[PDB]
Amino acid sequence: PIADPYAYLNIVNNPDGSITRDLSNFPCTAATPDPSPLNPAVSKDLPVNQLKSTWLRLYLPSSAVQKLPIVVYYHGGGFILCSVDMQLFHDFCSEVARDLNAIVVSPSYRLAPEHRLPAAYDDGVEALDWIKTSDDEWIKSHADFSNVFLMGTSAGGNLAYNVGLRSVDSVSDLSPLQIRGLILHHPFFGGEERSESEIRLMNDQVCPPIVTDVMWDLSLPVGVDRDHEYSNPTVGDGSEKLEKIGRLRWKVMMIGGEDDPMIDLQKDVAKLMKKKGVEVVEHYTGGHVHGAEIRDPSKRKTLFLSIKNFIFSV
């Protein structure tokens, strides 16, 4: 059982409210714009916001270099760790582009505690503003603006959900982008009281509650606890934006693993969405730990096939 969450996360507390991250465990890799048989996608980097130092990586199936659906992908890491150019996420997004036959837009976002929530959400929203006005040749030649999906893994799935909530009152300004769906891949949600699955899976070795407590403590706004809507979408009666999501027919795909301590809350978020009139496609798998398909590439294909079916289903 994980005894020390900070050592598990490879972080140290710093006397100004920051943390020191040991990056050596997660190597980064560069974009590769020229097609290569070793690379499932071509990729390139573009800046978004100079003040925030935010940017994004574009991915295109090697074959593309007949417009493709736009999958905006937000990476995971508890809102406190990890980057777009981490090999782990770069390889995943490249295979997403190839196997969905999609253009994948993977935006960076600022990390907590240096930039607590809702900073990441603001950055996730700004990435859509960027797509809408981009003159980039890959966007202009290959991106189907009518078929936008907001995707994310773990914290990125929480991020994608909250970008969806923030876009619902903004749909006029999103044009010529049209959002069709949200794809929530093991989204990072937690509450104050332990859920049934957090108790049952208390000794998880991937993302146990002792570790997520730390991540929420570092990323939530100063002064709030885990029953805030940022971490727990079910508090009260959920957002008053879910019914609108349902009326606009944005579909939501909720992907969860049954050995993830987060699973009870993830399933209850899907229930709430359905009660609010959202069309929810649920994809739950026994024996899968948090981030299963990130850590095990041999699980990716059937996930990608289900996502492709979801995308075609709109």
Residue numbers in the entry: 6 to 70, 78 to 326
Relevant lines from the article:
Arabidopsis thaliana (At) carboxylesterase 15 (CXE15) and carboxylesterase 20 (CXE20) have been shown to deplete strigolactones (SLs) that coordinate various growth and developmental processes and function as signaling molecules in the rhizosphere. Here, we elucidate the X-ray crystal structures of AtCXE15 (both apo and SL intermediate bound) and AtCXE20, revealing insights into the mechanisms of SL binding and catabolism. The N-terminal regions of CXE15 and CXE20 exhibit distinct secondary structures, with CXE15 characterized by an alpha helix and CXE20 by an alpha/beta fold. These structural differences play pivotal roles in regulating variable SL hydrolysis rates.
Strikingly, in contrast to AtCXE15, the cap domain of AtCXE20 comprises of NT α1 helix and anti-parallel β-sheet (β1 and β2), which we termed NT-α/β. Moreover, the loop connecting the NT-α/β to the core is longer in CXE20 compared to the loop connecting the NTH in AtCXE15 that is replaced by an extra β-strand. Additionally, CXE20 displays a short helix that connects the α9 and β9 regions, whereas this region is unstructured in CXE15. The main difference between the pockets can be attributed to the presence of negatively charged and hydrophobic residues in CXE15, and positively charged and hydrophobic residues in CXE20. CXE15 demonstrated much greater activity towards YLG hydrolysis than AtCXE20 with kcat values of 0.84 s−1 and 0.021 s−1, respectively.
